[PDB]
Design a protein around this nucleic acid. Structure first.
Lengths: 90, 55, 88, 100, 51
RNA sequence: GCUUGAGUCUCGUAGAGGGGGGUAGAAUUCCAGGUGUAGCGGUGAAAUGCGUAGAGAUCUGGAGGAAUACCGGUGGCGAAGGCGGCCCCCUGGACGAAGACUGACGCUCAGGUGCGAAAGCGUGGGGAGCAAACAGGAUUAGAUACCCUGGUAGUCCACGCCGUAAACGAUGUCGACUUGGAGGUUGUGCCCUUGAGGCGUGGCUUCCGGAGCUAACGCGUUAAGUCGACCGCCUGGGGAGUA
């Protein structure tokens, strides 16, 4: 599987987030790995709760699209990068 | 001058490889040079001066 | 274009005087002869535009000359227009 | 009214036809009231590069001032014959004799 | 365009041929004709030294 | 009424002006045959990818269309688009030498006819290589980007439509004058080609540089100078050559 990726950010607006999701769809059903690059701008360090909820919503958007393997534990740098895997055909 | 049959004088103005010397090195008037090109290629058509020693 | 002997024939037969080539009469006659001959060449190939330019130029020259002659005198214009068989 | 210079090619082993060949051209052009000036034959000479096999073909020289139609049909005669090879003709520039 | 030299060099030392390449004429003739551009040899280097 | 403005004949000169018909060589592919077992491929980004019933290599013959190596150098031609193998036929302009000849017959042009590179569309024909769309691999934070391997329309021919470009010398045309220089090129003068020197007496073109203009850069006898005859065009940027 190749390595494909698009930028992320918790506070991203609506429409471009959905186009990004559809692009990730096309890539997954064309067999591409899931990588996340989310850049942290300034004082985003005081929104842990809403950030966690937004990340959970992002993953929930892939409820019937793929399968989750790993969940973040620790932080090295400004971001945590997780890998998602294609869903077994049913 | 304008003739083509006198291959003997025409020979010294061409290279052993079959190419033609430019008028810059020779130092001749341009109209003479074009008349010379006319004569040499007319000879080339009639199979007197080879295109090159390739064959 | 026009051969020398044809020019001599036309100037001798049609001109007013001997060596009278300056007259507009011979000008018009020679121009008409040349254009009538060139009708044959433009009867074919229908694309030689770079001489269509010259044909148009000489047609315009004939037009201007004939206009000037008609403006100056009537009798010579009538004689020309009847003898040569043009314009109509 | 219009000069022409003519030289053509001919097969080397076919040198036997050359006399009658040039005779029938000269008879045709004389019937065409042409004015000949000089004749010459350089003979067979090795050529620079082989063309359709063959080597050392035979040459010819003519000279004539004449109308156009006649050179047209003699060019056609050069055309359909297969015992003849490359034929070339120049235009006017008047007439010059000698020059072997 | 031709090389008929000896063993020792074997590497580069043809940068003189790079200078003699004249990238303008090759880049001009490889792609289409211009008829007004190879003039760059003159009339725009010496004649445009503006201060 | 008159020739200085304008036009004609005598001879000659240069030239890749156009149209139509043949011919030739070198080079790519495809075909046959002879000697014969893995290459072509950014390999400083890295390899896939395909060629493996006899090939890249080398010879001997055919098929096949396309474009014409050095000459070629703003050197030449044209109203601007533009023009390059060689042969033949029809044909257009320019210019020179001194001769005669008609006697203002001119200049400019709103609407109108003509021409107008390459992409496009319609009828067919043709297809060597080429390469928009697509096909596959590498490519990184990120490629539906170029890099590589293939690959249709279309570039070619014969008839028709299409009227636009940075169609720029970014300088509409036609006249009469005003300081200089080293060239390319074109035909005649009487000599003194006799060496390649003296008449430019002309035409078309290069490159520097005064007086004079120019906001400046710079233009600078082919003016952006001093004058004349006309035409076409301009009044802040977006909204816009849009509705």
């Amino acid at each position: 599987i190749q390595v494909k990726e698009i930028k992320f950010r918790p506070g991203t607006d609506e429409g471009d987030y959905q186009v990004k999701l559809r692009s990730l769809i096309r890539f997954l059903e064309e067999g591409d790995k899931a990588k996340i690059t989310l850049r942290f701008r300034g004082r985003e360090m005081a929104h842990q709760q809403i950030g966690m909820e937004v990340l959970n919503r992002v993953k929930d958007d892939l409820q019937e699209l793929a399968v989750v393997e790993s969940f973040p534990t620790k932080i090295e740098g400004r971001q945590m990068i997780m890998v998602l895997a294609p869903k077994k055909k049913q | 001058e304008i003739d083509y049959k006198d291959i003997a004088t025409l020979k010294n103005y061409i290279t052993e490889s079959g190419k033609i010397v430019p008028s810059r090195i020779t130092g001749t008037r341009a109209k003479y040079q074009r008349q010379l090109a006319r004569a040499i290629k007319r000879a080339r058509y009639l199979s007197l001066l080879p295109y090159t020693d390739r064959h | 274009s026009l051969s020398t002997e044809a020019t001599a024939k036309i100037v001798s037969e049609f001109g007013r005087d001997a060596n009278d080539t300056g007259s507009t009469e011979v000008q018009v006659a020679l121009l008409t002869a040349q254009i009538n001959h060139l009708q044959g060449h433009f009867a074919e190939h229908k694309k030689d535009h770079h001489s269509r330019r010259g044909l148009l130029r000489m047609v315009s020259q004939r037009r201007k000359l004939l206009d000037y002659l008609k403006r100056k005198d009537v009798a010579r214009y009538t004689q020309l227009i009847e003898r040569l068989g043009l314009r109509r | 009214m219009r000069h022409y210079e003519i030289v053509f090619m001919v097969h080397p082993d076919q040198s036997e036809q050359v006399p009658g060949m040039i005779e029938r051209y000269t008879a045709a052009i004389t019937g065409a009231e042409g004015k000949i000036h000089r004749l010459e034959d350089w003979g067979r000479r090795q050529l620079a590069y082989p063309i359709n096999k063959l080597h050392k073909a035979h040459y010819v020289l003519m000279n004539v001032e004449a109308p156009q139609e006649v050179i047209d049909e003699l060019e056609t005669t050069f055309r359909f014959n297969d015992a003849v090879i490359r034929s070339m003709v120049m235009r006017t520039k008047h007439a010059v004799t000698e020059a072997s | 365009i031709k090389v008929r030299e000896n063993e020792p060099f074997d590497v580069a030392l043809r940068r003189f041929k790079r200078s003699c390449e004249k990238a303008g004429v090759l880049a001009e003739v490889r792609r289409r004709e211009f008829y007004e551009k190879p003039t760059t040899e003159r009339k725009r280097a010496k004649a445009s030294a503006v201060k």
